Design a protein around this ligand. Structure first.
Ligand SMILES: [Mg+2]
Ligand SMILES: [Mg+2]
Ligand SMILES: [Mg+2]
Ligand SMILES: [Mg+2]
Ligand SMILES: [Mg+2]
Ligand SMILES: [Mg+2]
Ligand SMILES: [Mg+2]
Ligand SMILES: [Mg+2]
Ligand SMILES: [Mg+2]
Ligand SMILES: [Mg+2]
Lengths: 254, 260, 224, 372, 88, 253
RNA sequence: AAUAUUUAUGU
RNA sequence: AACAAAAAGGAUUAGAUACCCCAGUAGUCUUUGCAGACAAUUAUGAAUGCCAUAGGUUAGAUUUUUAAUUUAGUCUAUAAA
C-alpha cells in the first residue's frame, strides 16, 4: 500500500507524514485485550520518585525505601528486582549515563552525536568496556561475571566525580563531521504516537474538560487510535485530581 | 452470562445488625447465589435464555416439564434476591396508608405477623412466605398471605409451579383429603388440556408480590442454630426478620389505590 | 468483450484533469467538484492481480508442472479429523440443537481447556470433547485413543446428570402440587393423528377411483 | 505464526460444524427409491438454533438470512443446512424437527441402552470402563479384545465379495513384512518363557530362523493362528471360541449419543399412590398390522415390532386417528447397522389408568371415587 | 446412469401449457355408446342404460375453469441460477 | 452482549475482527460462483465456500470510512444505496447520521446521466456555511440543473450495476461491498465482505454512517470559527458574476 | 402418436 | 435371397423425361488387379511454448475410496482477449 501513495511535489513534509500515519492505522488489528500497561500506575509513579535526582547514590537510596516493606508505593517486588539489576552493572557507566540524561536535555541532536563521539572514544581506552564485552559476549558467561574496576558504587567516595572526564573533548580525536548541517533542539514530528503526559497537560490548560469528557476528546482527535482510551486514562489516574468535583480536572503538583 | 449483583445497603460487607451476621449473609447470598447462577449458566449457556433475565425464565419455563430443572434455579435466584431487597439496616416505621390497609384485611398489624410466622413453621419445609396483592376485575385491592415450597413462584404466569401445599400430608381419604385430592387432579387435568380454572387479567397484574420470607434452612441454621429448647432456630429467625422489614418499600410496591 | 468498460478507479485522475484548464481559454478554471480534495490523498488499491494464495497445507513436492497455483486452498485443522471420529461414534449428538450464531465473537477469550470440558460461554457439545482431547493429546503427550477415552468419559458423566435432573425435577415438583403442560410425547401423537386421518381420506378417495376405473374398464356396453 | 484473523476463524462457531457423516449403511445389493427419501435412521447433519429475537429476522448465523415463511411460527426452531451456499446462490436447508424432537421423545422415556445378548434378562450398561474402551497396547490379549467395541479392521462376514478382494490386495498383502516382525516380538517371548523359572529355582527379536519355525507348526491348528492374525489386523472376533459377534461390531458407539443413562433400576415415586411397580406407560401407534407378515408399532418416533401377543391382527378403518395402544418399553439397544431396536412388551392395565389420572382423560378416577 | 444435464442458456424457461388439459369427460361416455351399437344394434334395449348416461352428461353444467398455474413465473426467477444463464 | 437491533440504535465507530466475524462478514459465495479476479481478498476455502480475510475487510472498511468522512467534511453530497428486502432501515439510519440521501428501491436508469428529465420537478435549496437557507437564489433554483451525488455507498453492487456505471460515466467516486462473486472493478473503493448477510450490511453501513456524522461535525465546528472547508460550486459560482453583471446595469443606468 | 391427391405464370 | 441405375409397363398431370406404383438388368457381396477423383469437413494443415474459471462426460491413478484430488481425451457456457 505504501508504494501506491503518490504525493504531489507541492505538498509540505507535514502532509506527507499525515497520509502515511492514516495508512498505518488502517492495518491495526487492535491491541491485546488482557495485556495491561506495564510501566503504569504504581510502577510509573515510583520511577518518577526514584529517578529524579542527579546522583546514583540518591537513586538507590530511594529504591531501598520503596523496597522496604511498609512503603506506601506498593512496588516492593519491582523495587527489589531493580536494585538487583543496578548492582550488577558497571558503576562507571551508571554515573556517566545518568550524567548525560540531565545534560542531554540541553543539547541539540547534532551536538549530541558529536559529544557522543568524543564520549564513546574514551570508553575504548577504559577498562570496564574491554572487560564487560570480553566477559559477557566473547566468553558468553564463561570465567564468571565481569569484574568492574570499581567493585561497587560505595567504593566511589561521595565527593568523587568520575563523570567529568567522559565529557571533555580531546584534541587527538577530531570532531565528528556530519553529512549535513541540519539540527534541532526538539523533535520536529514526534506526535504520531500515543498521547503522553505532555499532550494531556496542555489539553487541560487550554480547556475545561471533565474526567470522561477529556478521554473522548483525545479519542475523536486521534481518529480512534488503538490504546488512546487506556493511555489517556492512565495519565489522569497519576497526574490529575478531582478539583471541582466531576466537572474540572487539574494536575497534582499544584 | 448471569453474574452476581451487589446487595441493597452494603450487607455483604457488614450484614444486618440484629438479624444476620456478616458471615451468615456471605454464605446465604454471596456463596449460594453464585452457586445457583453457576448452575443456571450451564443450563442456558446455549439456549434462548442465555440473555434473558431470571423472571423471564421463571415464566417461560413454568409449564414445560422438560425445563423444570431450569425453573428451579431461576425462581430460586429471584425469590432469594427478592427477600434481601426488602430489608434495611434499621427498622422503618410502617406507613399510615399501608398500616390502615393491613387492619382492613387482617384485623391488626400483629395478626398478620403471627400468620406469616405461623405459616413458616407450620409448613415445615424449605420455601417462601409471600404477601401478595390480589385485585380482581371489580374487587378492591385486597391483601393475603401465600406460602410457596422449595422454588415456588407467586406470579400468576407461573401458576404451573406455585407449589402452595404439600401432597404427602394433605391428600388422603378424610373429607379434607378428598377435596384437596380432587383439586390436585382437576388442576393437572385442566393444565394439561390447556383449560384455565380461574380467569386471569392480561399482564399478570392480579398478584403482585410485595414482601417475602426465605424459610430455607441454609439461611438461618447457622445464625440461629437448630433451635433446641425453643431458643433460636427457625422461630426466632422469623421473629427477628419482622423487625427489618422495609415497610416504606413494602408500601411503594403495594401501589394501594387512593381511598382516604 | 460484451461487458462495458468501467473507469471508476480513475475518477480522480479524469476529474482532476478536466478541472486543470477551462474550456474558455484565457480564463481561470472554475472550482472543482467538492469531492476532488476529499480523496486527494486516498488513492484506490490495486485490484485484478492474482497473487500466490496462502497455502494451508504443504503443496505436493513431487509435481513437476503443477496447476491451480493462483487458486485458494482448503482450510484444514487437526480437529477436523477428531470431529469426524467423534460425531460418527455419536450420531445422535447432532440432534442436540447447537447455535452457531455468534454474539460478539469473543467466546474464545475465556476457553481454558486445561480445566475441563465445562467452559464459559459455550455449551457442552461434541466440540468441547474435541478441544479437550486435542489439549491432552498435545500438552500431556497422550495418544489419540487415550486422550479420546479420557475426554469422552468426562462427557458422559456430565450428560447423565442433565438427563437425571429432568426426571427428578418433574417428580419433585408434583410432590408439592406442581402441574405441567403437555409433554412432547403426547403432542407428537396428536400430530400423527391429524396427518394419518388426512391419509385415510386420500386412500379412501383413491381406492374409490381405482374400483370405479375397473367398472369402466370392463365392457358392460350391452346388458343381456 | 497464524494470523490474528485466522486465529478467530479457527475458534469460530461456524467452523465447528462437523462434516456430514455417512448415512446409515444399508444393503448394497438391494433396490432403492430414486427421488423420494424419508427420515434416516440417525441424523447426518447438525441441527441449528437461534434466539427468538433473531429468528424473527431470519438470522441463523449463516451466509444469508433464511425465509420467514418456512422458519417462523413453530414452537421449537430447528433447521438443517445441507449447503451454506449452493449453485443457486441459496442456502439449501430443511427443518430439523424430524430428528431434533425424536431425541427429546426418546430421552423422555428414561431408559438406558444395554448390550445385545442372545436369548434371566441380565442388563449391563454401555458406559463401563470394563467394556467402553478404545485405547489398547501390545500386551492386550484376545480375552480383553472381546470387551472393546471399536476395531480398526472390518467385519469379514459383512463385507461384500468385491470389497473383500480389495481389502486383501490393499491392506493384507502389503502387511506381510510387518507381520513377520510381529511374530519375532512374540518369539522373543517364546525363548524367554523357557526362562520362566531359570531365575527362581528378552532377546533382540530378530531371527529369520524362527518365524518360519513357528507358523509351519500352526498349520495343524488353524484356530490359534486366526486369533493371532486378528490381533495384527484388528478384526472383531467372529467364532465363539462372545460380544455379540453374530451380527458384527457396531459402526458407532453402543449408546450412539441418544441417551447417556446407565440404569432404569429406579422407582418413580408417585405423588399420591407412592412408589410404582413399573415405569409410566407410553401410547404407541400401529403400522403394518399382522394380516407382509409381522406387526409394527411406532414408539416415540422409532419403529419396533409389536409386543409378543385385536387391533394389531387386522386393519380397521373405523378407528379414529388409527389404532393406538398403551405399552411399556422394556429394553433398548443399538443395532450393528446403527438403528435403535426397542424390545417392546405390552403394558399392564391399571398403570394406563394411573397415567390417565394425571392427564385427566381417566373416565373413572382411581382416587376417592374408587370404592374397591 | 448419468445425472440430468445443466440446461444451456435459453431465451426463456417455461412450460408450453402450464395447466393440464382435462379431456371432456363425455367424449368417453360417447365412445361407450358407439360400442354398444356396433356389438348389438342401433335400436335395441341393452343400450338404454348407456344412452341415458350420455344424456345425463350434456344436461349437466360445465365445471368451472381451474385457477391458472404460476409455474412459469417461478421458472423465470431461477432460470439464470439453474441453467447456464440467459441468451439474447 | 448482543442485541439484533444494535447496529441501528448505536452503531460502532469502528469494526473489529470480532465484530466482522460475528456478523458473518467473512462468508463468501460457493467456490464455483466466484470471480477469479477478486481472489486477492480470499483467505481460504471451507464448507464449500470462499472465506474472505477478516483483516482485508477491516482495512478496506476503515479506508472507506476515511473517504466518507472527508467527503462529508468538504460539504459533499453522499448517497447510501441499499436495495434489498430488509435493507431499508439500515440505509435510512445511516443517511440520518451522515445527513445524506438514501435509496432503498430499484435505481431508475438515467437518474445521473439523464437527470434533467427525471429529477426535473424535485425542489432544491441553497444553504451556507452553517447549513441554513439563503434567500436570494429563487431565480437560480429554476434554471439550475439537478444535483448528482458526490459519493455513492452501495450495499449490493452485484444487483444494481446500472447505478455504478453511471457514476463511472459521471466521474463520481463509489464505495461498494464486493462479495466473492462481484466484480471489484465496478467501484472505486472496495469493501470485501459478505453482502448477503443483513447483519454484516448493518455493521458496514453503521460504521460509514458514523464516519459521515463525525465529518459533518468537524465541518460545522469549523464554520462557527469562520473557516469554510469548501469553496462555492462551479454552477453557483457562475450565477454570481452574472448577478453583479445585471446589477452593473443598475449602477450604469 | 408415423399421417401424405393436385397449386404453373407475373415487360 | 434382398435392394436397385438402366430398359420397359401402370398412374398422376395441361404435358411428366420425373416425384408415387407392379416388376426389373447392371451393380451392391467373394477373390485378384486397375482406377485415385469426394461437402475425402472441424468449410479450420501438422507441431511446439504459453493464458482465467465453471458444469458435464470418457479411460485410469491416488486418498480419511462415503467423497474429494489428479493425468491424458472429448463436449457445452463464460472471463481477459
Ligand atoms: Mg452475494
Ligand atoms: Mg419477374
Ligand atoms: Mg427409364
Ligand atoms: Mg413411367
Ligand atoms: Mg423390387
Ligand atoms: Mg493403387
Ligand atoms: Mg501435412
Ligand atoms: Mg473435462
Ligand atoms: Mg468421442
Ligand atoms: Mg464453446
Amino acid at each position: 500500500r505504501l508504494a501506491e501513495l503518490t504525493p504531489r511535489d507541492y505538498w509540505t513534509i507535514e502532509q506527507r507524514l499525515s497520509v502515511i500515519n492514516d495508512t498505518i492505522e488502517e492495518f491495526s488489528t487492535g491491541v491485546p485485550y488482557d495485556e495491561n500497561i506495564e510501566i503504569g500506575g504504581k510502577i510509573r509513579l515510583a520511577i518518577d520518585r526514584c529517578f529524579k535526582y542527579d546522583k546514583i547514590d540518591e537513586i538507590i537510596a530511594a529504591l531501598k525505601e520503596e523496597a522496604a516493606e511498609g512503603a506506601k508505593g506498593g512496588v516492593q517486588s519491582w523495587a527489589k528486582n531493580t536494585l538487583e539489576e543496578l548492582t550488577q552493572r558497571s558503576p562507571t557507566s551508571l554515573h556517566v549515563t545518568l550524567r548525560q540524561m540531565r545534560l542531554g536535555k540541553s543539547w541539540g541532536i547534532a551536538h549530541t552525536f558529536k559529544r557522543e563521539h568524543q564520549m564513546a572514544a574514551k570508553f575504548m581506552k577504559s577498562h570496564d568496556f574491554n572487560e564487560g564485552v570480553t566477559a559477557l559476549l566473547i566468553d558468553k558467561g564463561a570465567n564468571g561475571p565481569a569484574k568492574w574496576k570499581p567493585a561497587s558504587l560505595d567504593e566511589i567516595p561521595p565527593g568523587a566525580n568520575i563523570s567529568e572526564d567522559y565529557f571533555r573533548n580531546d584534541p587527538e580525536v577530531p570532531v565528528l563531521e556530519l553529512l549535513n548541517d541540519r539540527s534541532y533542539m526538539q523533535y520536529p514530528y514526534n506526535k504520531f504516537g500515543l498521547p503522553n503526559d505532555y499532550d494531556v497537560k496542555e489539553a487541560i490548560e487550554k480547556g475545561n474538560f471533565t474526567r470522561e469528557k477529556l478521554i473522548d476528546h483525545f479519542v475523536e482527535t486521534r481518529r480512534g487510535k488503538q490504546g488512546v482510551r487506556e493511555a489517556v486514562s492512565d495519565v489522569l489516574d497519576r497526574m490529575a485530581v478531582r478539583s471541582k468535583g466531576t466537572e474540572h480536572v487539574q494536575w497534582k503538583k499544584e | 452470562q448471569h453474574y452476581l449483583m451487589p446487595l441493597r445497603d452494603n450487607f455483604e460487607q457488614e450484614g444486618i445488625r440484629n438479624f444476620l451476621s456478616p458471615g451468615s449473609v456471605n454464605m446465604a447470598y454471596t456463596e449460594y447465589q453464585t452457586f445457583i447462577l453457576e448452575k443456571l449458566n450451564a443450563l442456558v449457556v446455549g439456549t434462548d435464555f442465555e440473555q434473558k433475565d431470571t423472571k423471564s425464565i421463571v415464566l417461560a419455563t413454568a409449564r414445560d416439564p422438560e425445563l423444570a430443572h431450569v425453573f428451579n434455579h431461576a425462581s430460586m435466584a429471584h425469590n432469594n434476591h427478592f427477600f434481601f431487597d426488602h430489608l434495611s439496616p434499621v427498622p422503618v416505621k410502617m406507613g399510615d396508608k399501608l398500616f390502615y390497609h393491613i387492619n382492613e384485611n387482617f384485623g391488626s398489624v400483629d395478626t398478620l405477623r403471627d400468620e406469616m410466622i405461623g405459616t413458616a413453621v407450620s409448613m415445615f419445609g424449605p420455601g417462601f412466605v409471600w404477601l401478595v396483592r390480589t385485585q380482581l376485575p371489580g374487587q378492591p385491592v385486597a391483601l393475603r398471605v401465600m406460602a410457596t415450597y422449595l422454588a415456588g413462584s407467586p406470579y400468576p404466569g407461573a401458576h404451573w409451579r406455585r407449589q402452595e401445599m404439600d401432597a404427602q400430608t394433605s391428600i388422603g381419604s378424610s373429607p379434607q383429603g378428598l377435596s384437596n385430592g380432587q383439586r390436585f387432579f382437576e388442576r393437572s387435568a385442566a393444565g394439561f388440556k390447556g383449560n384455565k380454572l380461574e380467569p386471569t387479567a392480561p399482564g399478570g397484574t392480579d398478584l403482585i408480590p410485595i414482601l417475602c420470607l426465605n424459610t430455607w434452612e441454609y439461611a438461618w441454621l447457622r445464625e440461629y442454630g437448630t433451635g433446641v429448647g425453643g431458643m433460636g432456630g427457625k422461630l426466632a429467625y422469623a421473629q427477628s426478620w419482622w423487625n427489618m422489614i422495609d415497610w416504606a418499600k413494602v408500601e411503594e410496591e403495594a401501589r394501594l389505590e387512593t381511598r382516604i | 468483450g460484451k461487458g462495458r468498460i468501467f473507469q471508476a478507479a480513475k475518477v480522480y485522475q479524469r476529474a482532476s484533469e478536466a478541472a486543470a484548464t477551462n474550456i474558455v481559454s484565457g480564463l481561470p478554471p472554475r472550482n472543482p467538484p467538492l469531492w476532488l480534495k476529499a480523496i486527494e490523498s486516498i488513492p484506490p488499491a490495486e485490484i485484478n492481480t492474482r497473487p500466490y494464495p496462502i497455502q494451508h497445507s504443504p503443496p505436493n513436492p513431487r509435481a513437476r508442472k503443477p496447476r491451480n497455483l493462483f487458486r485458494p486452498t482448503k482450510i484444514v485443522y487437526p480437529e477436523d479429523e477428531l470431529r469426524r471420529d467423534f460425531y460418527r461414534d455419536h450420531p445422535w449428538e447432532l440432534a442436540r440443537p447447537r447455535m452457531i450464531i455468534e454474539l460478539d465473537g469473543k467466546d474464545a477469550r475465556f476457553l481454558d481447556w486445561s480445566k475441563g470440558l465445562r467452559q464459559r460461554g459455550i455449551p457442552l457439545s461434541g466440540e468441547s470433547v474435541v478441544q479437550r482431547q486435542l489439549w491432552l493429546m498435545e500438552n500431556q503427550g497422550m495418544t489419540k485413543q487415550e486422550a479420546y477415552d479420557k475426554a469422552r468419559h468426562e462427557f458422559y458423566k456430565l450428560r447423565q446428570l442433565e438427563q437425571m435432573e429432568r426426571r427428578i425435577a418433574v417428580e419433585e415438583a408434583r410432590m408439592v402440587g406442581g402441574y405441567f403442560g403437555k409433554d412432547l410425547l403426547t403432542v407428537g401423537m396428536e400430530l400423527e393423528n391429524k396427518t394419518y386421518e388426512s391419509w385415510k381420506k386420500w386412500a379412501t378417495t383413491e381406492i374409490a377411483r381405482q374400483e370405479s376405473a375397473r367398472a369402466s374398464m370392463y365392457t358392460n356396453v350391452v346388458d343381456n | 505464526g497464524v494470523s490474528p484473523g485466522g486465529a478467530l476463524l479457527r475458534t469460530s462457531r461456524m467452523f465447528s460444524l462437523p462434516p456430514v457423516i455417512p448415512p446409515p449403511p444399508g444393503n448394497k445389493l438391494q433396490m432403492i427409491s430414486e427421488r423420494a427419501s424419508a427420515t434416516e435412521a440417525y441424523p447426518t447433519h447438525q441441527v441449528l438454533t437461534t434466539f427468538e429475537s433473531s429468528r424473527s429476522r431470519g438470522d441463523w448465523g449463516l451466509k444469508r438470512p433464511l425465509p420467514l415463511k418456512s422458519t417462523t411460527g413453530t414452537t421449537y426452531p430447528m433447521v438443517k443446512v445441507k449447503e451454506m451456499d449452493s449453485l443457486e446462490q441459496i442456502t439449501d436447508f430443511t427443518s430439523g424437527t424430524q430428528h431434533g424432537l425424536t431425541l427429546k421423545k426418546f430421552q423422555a422415556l428414561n431408559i438406558p441402552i444395554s448390550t445385545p445378548s442372545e436369548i434371566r434378562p441380565v442388563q449391563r450398561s454401555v458406559f463401563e470402563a470394563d467394556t467402553d474402551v478404545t485405547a489398547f497396547s501390545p500386551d492386550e490379549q484376545i480375552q480383553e479384545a472381546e470387551k472393546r467395541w471399536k476395531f480398526s479392521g472390518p467385519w469379514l462376514a459383512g463385507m461384500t465379495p468385491g470389497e473383500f478382494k480389495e481389502y486383501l490386495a490393499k491392506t493384507v498383502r502389503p502387511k506381510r513384512a510387518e507381520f513377520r516382525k510381529f511374530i519375532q516380538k512374540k518369539i522373543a517371548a517364546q525363548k524367554t518363557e523357557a526362562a520362566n523359572r531359570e531365575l527362581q529355582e528378552k532377546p533382540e527379536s530378530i531371527t529369520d530362523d524362527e518365524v518360519t519355525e513357528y507358523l509351519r507348526r500352526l498349520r495343524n491348528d488353524n484356530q490359534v493362528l486366526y486369533d493371532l492374525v486378528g490381533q495384527f489386523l484388528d478384526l472383531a472376533p467372529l467364532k465363539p471360541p462372545s460380544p455379540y459377534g453374530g451380527r458384527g461390531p457396531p459402526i458407532t458407539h453402543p449408546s450412539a449419543g441418544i441417551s447417556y443413562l446407565r440404569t432404569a433400576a429406579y422407582l418413580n415415586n408417585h405423588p399420591i399412590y407412592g412408589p410404582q411397580k413399573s415405569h409410566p406407560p407410553v401410547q404407541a401407534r400401529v403400522l403394518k398390522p399382522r394380516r407382509g407378515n409381522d406387526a409394527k408399532i411406532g414408539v416415540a418416533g422409532f419403529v419396533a415390532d409389536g409386543p409378543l401377543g385385536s387391533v394389531m391382527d387386522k386393519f380397521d378403518p373405523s378407528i379414529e386417528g388409527g389404532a393406538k395402544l398403551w405399552v411399556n418399553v422394556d429394553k433398548a439397544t443399538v443395532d450393528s447397522t446403527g438403528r435403535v431396536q426397542l424390545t417392546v412388551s405390552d403394558a399392564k392395565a391399571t398403570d394406563v389408568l394411573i397415567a390417565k389420572e394425571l392427564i385427566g382423560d381417566a373416565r373413572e378416577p382411581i382416587f376417592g371415587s374408587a370404592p374397591k | 446412469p448419468n445425472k440430468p444435464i445443466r440446461l444451456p442458456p435459453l431465451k426463456q424457461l417455461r412450460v408450453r401449457q402450464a395447466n393440464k388439459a382435462e379431456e371432456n369427460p363425455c367424449i368417453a361416455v360417447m365412445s361407450s355408446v358407439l360400442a354398444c351399437w356396433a356389438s348389438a344394434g342401433y335400436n335395441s334395449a341393452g343400450c338404454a342404460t348407456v344412452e341415458n348416461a350420455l344424456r345425463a352428461c350434456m344436461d349437466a353444467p360445465k365445471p368451472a375453469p381451474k385457477p391458472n398455474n404460476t409455474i412459469n413465473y417461478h421458472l423465470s426467477r431461477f432460470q439464470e441460477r439453474l441453467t447456464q444463464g440467459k441468451s439474447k | 452482549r448482543y442485541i439484533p437491533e444494535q447496529y441501528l440504535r448505536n452503531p460502532p465507530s469502528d469494526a473489529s475482527l470480532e465484530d466482522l466475524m460475528a456478523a458473518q462478514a467473512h462468508m463468501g459465495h460457493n467456490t464455483s460462483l466466484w470471480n477469479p479476479a477478486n481472489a486477492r481478498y480470499i483467505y481460504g476455502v471451507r464448507q464449500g465456500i470462499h472465506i474472505i480475510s477478516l483483516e482485508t475487510t477491516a482495512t478496506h472498511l476503515r479506508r472507506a470510512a476515511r473517504v466518507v468522512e472527508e467527503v462529508a467534511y468538504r460539504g459533499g453530497l453522499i448517497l447510501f444505496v441499499g436495495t434489498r428486502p430488509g435493507q431499508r432501515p439500515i440505509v435510512v439510519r445511516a443517511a440520518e447520521l451522515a445527513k445524506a440521501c438514501h435509496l432503498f428501491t430499484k435505481w431508475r436508469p438515467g437518474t445521473i446521466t439523464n437527470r434533467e428529465q427525471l429529477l426535473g420537478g424535485v425542489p432544491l435549496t441553497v444553504v451556507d456555511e452553517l447549513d441554513r437557507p439563503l434567500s436570494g437564489f429563487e431565480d437560480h433554483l429554476h434554471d439550475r440543473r439537478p444535483l448528482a451525488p458526490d459519493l455513492v455507498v452501495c450495499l449490493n453492487p452485484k444487483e444494481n450495476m446500472t447505478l455504478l456505471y453511471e457514476c463511472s460515466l459521471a466521474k463520481i467516486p463509489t464505495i461498494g461491498i464486493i462479495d466473492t462473486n462481484t466484480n471489484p472493478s465496478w467501484v472505486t473503493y472496495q469493501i470485501p465482505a459478505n453482502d448477503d448477510s443483513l447483519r454484516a450490511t448493518a455493521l458496514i453501513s453503521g460504521v460509514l454512517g458514523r464516519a459521515g456524522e463525525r465529518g459533518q461535525k468537524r465541518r460545522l465546528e469549523a464554520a462557527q470559527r469562520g473557516v469554510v472547508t469548501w469553496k462555492t460550486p462551479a454552477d453557483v459560482q457562475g450565477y454570481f458574476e452574472l448577478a453583479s453583471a445585471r446589477a452593473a446595469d443598475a449602477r450604469r443606468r
